[PDB]
Amino acid sequence: TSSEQIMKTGALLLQGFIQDRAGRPQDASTKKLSESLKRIGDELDSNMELQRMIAAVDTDSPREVFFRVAADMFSDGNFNWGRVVALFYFASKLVLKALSTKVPELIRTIMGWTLDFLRERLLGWIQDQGGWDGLLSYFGTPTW
Amino acid sequence: TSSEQIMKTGALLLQGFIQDRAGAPELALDPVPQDASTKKLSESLKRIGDELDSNMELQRMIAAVDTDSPREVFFRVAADMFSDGNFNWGRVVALFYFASKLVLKALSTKVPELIRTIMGWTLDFLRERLLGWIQDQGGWDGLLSYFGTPTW
Ligand SMILES: [Cl-]
Ligand SMILES: [Pr+3]
Ligand SMILES: [Pr+3]
């Protein structure tokens, strides 16, 4: 049904696309579509225009960066499947940049708190053990 | 071997311990030294921490479900781990254990949340700006025969 069926398979294709990019039903017809998608997206990695066009853009930035770039990709009123896929590609690039920066920043912030507590509360005690080597002098378990 | 060596070594062990319990990201810090000494301690934390999985007292201490931003959570919990004024290696390792479970928890929500909100923008734009054209092709099956390179 070329009315609603489009979006159900779009949401499905997109999610499968993103998920793949991040690693580096899904029935019969769907499988074969996903495959071509993967092929087109893989080809896009070598598309120097696309690559330039994304490069000219400061990521981990608001929806205003997305909707503007998405717009320039279709300024000329023309459409094709390569252009549609390149939209997905962009969305994936944005997800991947986010992960690449927001995730290590998450990890760093929490490492921050831990080491903060460790200094203000444990540094002293650890000194008395002879340092971190007291750790191998330990085969017990905490109880509270 | 105190004062400054404690913090440098402390951070290295923390990093490696967390990266261990995760599924690799480039933290852009100093790489974990691959020497005898720190490979020893690292393998010590793992043994101690492997036990902590079955330590339900700690699992209770640590337990919460998106009740709050991990921040004041972390400090209240970490203080509570040391409220009775007693120290030993088990609560030091357990502090490291907690840190990684909190990272994992945060990831398990931040990350999907991120992919969902970005998918909505794409699925928006596809509905606003591309849906009709796709109809005019008879759906996505046209994609199976596309072998071009888009231009702009
Ligand atoms: Cl080919
Ligand atoms: Pr502080
Ligand atoms: Pr809209």
Side-chain angles (χ1 to χ4, degrees), chain A residues 1-4 6-7 9-30 32-144, chain B residues 1-38 40-42 44-56 58-67 69-75 77-152:
Chain A
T1 288
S2 332
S3 216
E4 334 163 331
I6 304 194
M7 301 293 305
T9 79
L12 216 76
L13 285 188
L14 186 55
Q15 197 195 69
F17 186 80
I18 303 256
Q19 289 176 1
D20 173 60
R21 286 290 157 157
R24 70 182 69 189
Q26 195 53 216
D27 53 55
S29 66
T30 302
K32 270 201 169 176
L33 283 160
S34 284
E35 295 177 3
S36 319
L37 199 44
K38 202 202 167 196
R39 178 202 97 229
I40 300 178
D42 282 21
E43 295 169 5
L44 282 182
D45 281 317
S46 302
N47 190 322
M48 299 316 179
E49 273 161 326
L50 184 48
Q51 231 62 28
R52 262 169 248 125
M53 181 179 323
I54 299 185
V57 162
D58 284 356
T59 87
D60 248 355
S61 272
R63 22 157 9 137
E64 278 84 1
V65 157
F66 171 81
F67 279 104
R68 178 181 70 136
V69 159
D72 295 317
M73 294 189 45
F74 296 88
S75 98
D76 59 29
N78 290 258
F79 306 114
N80 64 62
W81 290 115
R83 278 199 179 173
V84 159
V85 172
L87 176 77
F88 282 13
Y89 191 86
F90 183 33
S92 203
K93 228 65 176 174
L94 296 190
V95 171
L96 294 190
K97 306 296 185 160
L99 295 190
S100 88
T101 66
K102 313 221 156 191
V103 168
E105 193 192 59
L106 184 272
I107 297 181
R108 266 194 265 103
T109 302
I110 299 160
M111 288 194 59
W113 301 339
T114 318
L115 296 174
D116 212 334
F117 192 94
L118 189 285
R119 206 210 331 108
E120 310 201 298
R121 297 291 282 269
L122 301 157
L123 184 271
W125 176 89
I126 301 165
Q127 271 163 336
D128 321 351
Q129 306 310 295
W132 278 106
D133 297 287
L135 195 67
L136 314 123
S137 321
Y138 187 91
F139 294 89
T141 60
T143 58
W144 301 277
Chain B
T1 58
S2 322
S3 277
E4 41 183 353
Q5 296 124 343
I6 286 170
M7 291 311 287
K8 178 164 191 56
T9 310
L12 294 161
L13 295 178
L14 191 41
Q15 180 190 355
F17 171 93
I18 282 187
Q19 268 174 351
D20 214 26
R21 322 214 154 207
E26 209 170 337
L27 301 182
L29 297 167
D30 296 296
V32 191
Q34 211 88 339
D35 54 75
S37 174
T38 76
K40 285 150 173 264
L41 302 182
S42 257
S44 229
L45 276 162
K46 200 199 204 160
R47 147 182 75 82
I48 303 182
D50 285 345
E51 280 317 290
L52 292 165
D53 290 328
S54 47
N55 190 310
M56 312 302 295
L58 175 81
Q59 303 300 318
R60 192 200 51 77
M61 288 250 45
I62 269 183
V65 165
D66 269 276
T67 4
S69 75
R71 181 174 178 101
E72 286 72 16
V73 182
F74 166 88
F75 289 113
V77 173
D80 210 88
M81 299 200 9
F82 294 97
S83 47
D84 78 334
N86 211 15
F87 305 112
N88 56 93
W89 287 108
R91 341 192 160 195
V92 178
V93 176
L95 178 77
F96 275 11
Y97 189 91
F98 174 32
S100 110
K101 304 270 94 51
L102 193 43
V103 157
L104 286 158
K105 203 176 272 165
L107 283 204
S108 79
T109 95
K110 303 260 161 293
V111 173
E113 203 195 323
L114 159 70
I115 305 177
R116 287 186 203 116
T117 93
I118 265 145
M119 280 177 55
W121 298 344
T122 317
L123 291 177
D124 253 343
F125 186 98
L126 157 55
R127 172 180 41 78
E128 330 266 276
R129 283 282 271 289
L130 310 177
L131 190 274
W133 180 85
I134 299 186
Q135 294 193 282
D136 299 347
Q137 306 291 114
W140 295 93
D141 283 345
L143 193 72
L144 308 152
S145 346
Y146 178 79
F147 298 93
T149 83
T151 32
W152 311 279

